[PDB]
Each structure stands twice: as C-alpha cells, then as structure tokens.
Design a protein around this nucleic acid. Structure first.
Ligand SMILES: [K+]
Length: 118
DNA sequence: GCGGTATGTTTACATTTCG
DNA sequence: CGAAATGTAAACATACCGC
C-alpha cells in the first residue's frame, strides 16, 4: 500500500482540522490526529511534518491560540474570519489563487454547512 | 529536584506557485 | 520571469509530566 504526499498545503489541512470541530477550536495534538486520519500519507510518514505544522500555526496570521492540558487550543483568527464573512456575504470572491489556501477551505466549509464555526 | 517530552516562537534558505 | 508563498530545516525558549 503506497502513499503519495498530497499537494494540499499545511495551512490548508490545518484549516480543515479547525473547521471539523463543533467549536471551531482544536488542540495541536488533535490537529496531528486529524491529518493522520484524513491523509494516510502522514499517518505512516517518517518526515518531520509536525515541525512544519507547528511552524504554520505560529507564523500564519489566520491561526490564533485561544486560552481554552499540555497545550492550548487553536482557532481561526477573528480578523480573518470576520473578513471572509464580509466578503462572502458581499458577493462572490475573487478567483485569485495566490495565498488563498485558507480562504478556499473557508469557501468549501461555508458552501456545505452555511456557517464558519467559532 | 531532574531528566525527558510536548508545545510554541523565530530565523534562514530552498522550492513551488502563478500572474 | 520573479515576487510572493509555501516547504523544509534548525535553534532554542517555555511549559508540562512522571518519578
Ligand atoms: K499565528
């Protein structure tokens, strides 16, 4: 059973993990599990993808620690969530792709569930 | 009390993306 | 093409855990 590294970006998989929870907040440990559950490649891969995940959570503006026991929880920032909701309800979004990896996951979750968790 | 591990920040360079 | 974004590696801080 061979597995290939999916082309999805780390920020895209993280956004997916946060939107999967009912409260829109999730711990690093559960983000690891979500990735291994939904993308089998990372379940058995030896590379240090967790280092890259942590790098993306801290550096990407869209991800923000919530006070919320080893680690705290992560959610989508209020600025990025409020911004998307305003653009979503004000009309179609631009077809631009550069840097919209998080925006696309919000678009998908919104078109299926009608709301971004919080 | 200490060693060990998990979480989080930050910097640097390589690689891919896409107007 | 190339600025911007993402990928990968690394140094190191901070907190937690189990004894
Ligand atoms: K961040």
């Amino acid at each position: 059973n061979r597995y290939i590294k999916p082309p999805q970006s780390y920020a895209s998989m993280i956004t997916q993990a946060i939107l999967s929870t009912p409260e829109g907040s999730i711990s690093l440990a559960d983000i690891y599990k979500f990735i291994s559950d939904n993308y089998a490649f990372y379940r058995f891969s030896q590379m240090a993808w967790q280092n890259s995940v942590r790098h993306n959570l801290s550096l990407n503006k869209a991800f923000e620690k919530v006070p919320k026991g080893k680690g705290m929880n992560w959610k989508i920032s209020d600025e990025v969530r409020r911004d998307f909701l305003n653009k979503w309800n004000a009309g179609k979004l631009s077809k631009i792709r550069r840097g919209a990896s998080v925006t696309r996951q919000l678009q998908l979750h919104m078109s299926k569930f009608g709301e971004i968790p919080a």
